[PDB]
């Protein structure tokens, strides 16, 4: 009686939300960007080849200087790379051999990795002793940590395999804010350029917008039909794109609260593990499990380029802030840069 | 020749880091990686006691062999995400308690505690990631199994089981049920064993099983097979 009443009330609310979403739809992205000229066939080539890892690579993040990048692998070490000279700056031996995410501080002094141990370790790159040391370990989670992105030097948002996200304070090592709106494993999070909001993707085939200050959920998206494993904000912050195992990519805006465009091909059966945008948002790069990479025009939903440098599942993809370089990681222990 | 003084030393630092990573990889290549798996109340402590955070690791050495076990029994989430992180292990150490034939799960349902292990055993065996990785099955609580079947018939879990109600006869039927779940008989082989309580056989059975899989795998990369 009461359960059915609450369920029908929730269903009425969902129907009202769906009607508000559908009624506020004049046209699609294809009709608006119909007269836009195509980007053309994009051809990239390997400019740099990094071969320092001995195991599968799961994560790779760029720094704010466009020259340093961090990469995480199953061998148990974090390596800082020099993109212009193919040199290693620091070697960080990890305590846990299983790591699935890595981050780089915006100032460039801290690097945090996650893993299956439910612990986020803060490493200080700039020390007065010439050695990377552990700053603070965050163990207030009950699931595997899948993503971590630094809001600033003292505050970092870390999403884990549990339905609860968190905001941490490195100086105190406490969980200041908890996000308990998801019903599945959260795979990736993407911070906004203003460092005030972030969209998280979960395995429940749904994405939710969050706030760093209030800790409440604002919008919910349900376009995907499978577990969303990758997420990335548009450079303006107006929108974001996700990627699931349904061999389909979709673009969800924050102002319209509806699916703008869809990215799918008939010959694509594999899933999506990484998604990133160009400096201007005109080109989209996604990580496929077909041992290759693809480039998609965001405005026209057309394939622009196909990268086939790696020989294994392409786990990660990153773009420099300048746009002057694009790196791509994979389970094959070889890192490459395209431009 | 076209590098400065500070760059030529960074190159040497990078070469030293590469030399260290190579020796670390060569040292980690002489170690055996075993995935420790088990359903609820599967008596895992049996082997862990003899050998002596979400994922727990245990490192022991036996006969100049560095074994590393990684228990994943404390990870309560979607297995599909973290199951591929263990691709390439030597073998899996699965545990099934024999006293589960007449017990029900925490949720009162028609599902039996013995069939619950069969569902997890069939899943890990048919996983796309685990195709040639062998399984070391340790049947725990062999003593309580004999006493309970004397008081209650085995027809509770296996009604079609028609035979003599004894220890050897009933345990043999349970072993066949788990071994018949392996669809790919050619690629992977199951190694069933009974957990000796007082004896130290368990650590010896793993030694015989790991050395056997390595021999079966070394010939696969030499042209004999």
């Amino acid at each position: 009686s009461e359960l059915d009443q609450l369920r029908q009330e929730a269903e009425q609310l969902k129907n009202q939300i769906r009607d508000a979403r559908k009624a506020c739809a004049d046209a699609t992205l294809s009709q608006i960007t119909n007269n836009i000229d195509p980007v053309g066939r994009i051809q990239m080539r390997t400019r740099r080849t990094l071969r320092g890892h001995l195991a599968k690579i799961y994560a790779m993040h760029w720094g704010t200087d466009s020259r340093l990048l961090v990469s995480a692998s199953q061998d148990g070490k974090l390596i800082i790379w020099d993109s212009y000279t193919t040199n290693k700056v620091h070697a960080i031996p990890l305590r846990s051999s299983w790591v699935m995410t890595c981050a780089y501080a915006p100032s460039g002094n801290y690097v945090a990795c996650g893993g299956l141990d439910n612990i986020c370790s803060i490493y200080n790159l700039k020390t007065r002793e010439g050695n990377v040391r552990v700053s603070r370990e965050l163990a207030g989670h009950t699931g595997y940590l899948s993503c971590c992105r630094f809001l600033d030097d003292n505050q970092i948002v870390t999403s884990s395999g549990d339905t609860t996200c968190a905001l941490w304070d490195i100086e105190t090592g406490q969980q200041t804010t908890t996000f308990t709106g998801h019903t599945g494993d959260v795979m990736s999070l993407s911070l906004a350029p203003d460092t005030r909001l972030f969209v998280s993707g979960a395995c429940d085939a749904s994405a939710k917008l969050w706030d760093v200050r209030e800790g409440m959920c604002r919008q919910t998206f349900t376009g995907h039909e499978s577990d969303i494993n990758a997420i990335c904000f548009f450079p303006n912050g107006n929108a974001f794109a996700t990627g699931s195992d349904d061999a389909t990519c979709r673009l969800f805006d924050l102002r319209a609260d509806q699916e703008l465009m869809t990215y799918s091909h008939d010959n694509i059966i594999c899933g999506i593990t990484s998604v990133s945008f160009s400096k201007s948002g005109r080109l989209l790069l996604a990580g496929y499990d077909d041992f290759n990479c693809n480039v998609w025009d965001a405005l026209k939903a057309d394939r622009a380029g196909v990268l086939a440098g790696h020989d294994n599942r392409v786990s990660c993809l990153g773009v420099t802030d300048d746009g002057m370089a694009v790196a791509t990681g994979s389970w094959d222990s070889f890192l490459k840069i395209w431009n | 020749c076209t590098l400065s003084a500070e760059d030529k030393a960074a190159v040497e630092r990078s070469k030293m880091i590469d030399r260290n990573l190579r020796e670390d990889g060569e040292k980690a290549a002489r170690e055996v990686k075993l995935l420790l798996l088990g359903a609820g109340e599967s008596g895992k402590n049996t082997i862990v006691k003899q050998m002596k955070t979400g994922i727990v690791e245990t490192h022991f050495t036996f006969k100049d062999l560095h074994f590393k076990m990684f228990d994943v029994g404390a990870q309560r989430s979607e297995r599909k995400k973290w199951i591929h992180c263990f691709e390439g292990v030597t073998a899996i150490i699965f545990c099934v308690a024999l006293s589960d034939y007449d017990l029900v799960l925490a949720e009162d349902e028609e599902m039996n505690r013995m069939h619950a292990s069969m569902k997890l055993f069939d899943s890990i065996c048919n996983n796309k990631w685990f195709t040639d990785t062998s399984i070391i099955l340790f049947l725990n609580k062999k003593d309580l199994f004999e006493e309970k079947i004397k008081k209650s018939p085995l027809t509770i879990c296996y009604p079609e089981y028609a035979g003599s109600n004894t220890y050897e006869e009933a345990a043999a039927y349970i072993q066949c049920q788990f071994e018949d779940l392996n669809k790919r008989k050619d690629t992977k082989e199951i190694y069933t064993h009974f957990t000796c309580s007082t004896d130290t056989k368990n650590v010896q059975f793993v030694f015989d099983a790991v050395t056997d899989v390595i021999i079966k795998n070394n010939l696969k990369d030499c042209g004999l097979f």
Partner: single-chain antibody
Amino acid sequence: VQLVESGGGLVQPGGSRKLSCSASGFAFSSFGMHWVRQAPEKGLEWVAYISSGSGTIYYADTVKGRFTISRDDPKNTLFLQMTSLRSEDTAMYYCVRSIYYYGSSPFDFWGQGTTLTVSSDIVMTQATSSVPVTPGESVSISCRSSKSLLHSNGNTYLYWFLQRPGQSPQLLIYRMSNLASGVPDRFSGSGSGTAFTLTISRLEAEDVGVYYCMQHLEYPLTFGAGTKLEL
């Protein structure tokens, strides 16, 4: 980080003596070691250098063939063997640590020093020797070189050091445009081509001593005459 040096004293000419340094508080293996000595009157000159891993050993032209530098990684001790000492071997040797990577600051620490008394190179020259600026006014210290220190990578390998009276040298600005750790924002300088300048603002009583310069484009590292500010 503390570097203690000992083993120096009075030695007759024609003999031999060894210097040792005690490193602690940091990774001695990851930091390269330098040797710099100061004449009793004025002047700095690089004497030896070894890279991380007991390789890339360099010596000075004056002491070529007579000095031997070695480092012990397990005990974190630096060694320097001297043979056939002459009348020129009268200078206080300061042990320096350095590490080289992107964003690193070489010559970031200088030991107290050990006294020693015996009974195509880039040349840095500056005519200015003393500056009468009173406390509270800005100062300017200019230096010149024999050729452009800029490299194809874009970095100008210029270094500035300050040796306060009765104190060890300290790194103020490295790479020409970057500031070291623990240095206030008062010390700053920027120079292109072959002419450089150091513009100190809000001069304090502690900011006194001799200001030196060094180039690291090529070896041998050569210092300059330097300007000694007065208070």
